Amino acid sequence: LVNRTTLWGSAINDMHPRNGADYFTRVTLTMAKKGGLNFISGDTIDA
Amino acid sequence: LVNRTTLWGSAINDMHPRNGADYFTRVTLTMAKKGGLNFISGDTIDA
Numbered sequence: 346l347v348n349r350t351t352l353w354g355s356a357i358n359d360m361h362p363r364n365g366a367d368y369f370t371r372v373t374l375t376m377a378k379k380g381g382l383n384f385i386s387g388d389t390i391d392a
Numbered sequence: 393l394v395n396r397t398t399l400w401g402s403a404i405n406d407m408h409p410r411n412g413a414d415y416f417t418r419v420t421l422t423m424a425k426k427g428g429l430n431f432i433s434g435d436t437i438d439a
Binding site for chain 2: 375377378379380381
């Protein structure tokens with residue numbers, strides 16, 4: 346007295362073998378500078 | 393059973409003997425002013 350259902354399939358999700366990761370760059374933004382404004386708090390920074 | 397093809401020629405590529413060096417100049421840009429903007433980093437250049 347048990348009913349069961351299954352799903353199965355094959356697919357490819359990976360970067361290109363030749364020169365793949367070169368297409369991406371990661372950019373991080375710092376937010377600390379003299380005489381600046383942060384919209385998070387709306388306050389001056391060391392000025 | 394060897395194949396070989398060659399290219400040969402002559403030309404002139406040189407700077408003029410009469411005061412040639414006077415026609416060119418080099419300008420070096422610097423980023424050291426006080427109270428300026430750094431466009432590479434996006435912050436005030438050392439306060």
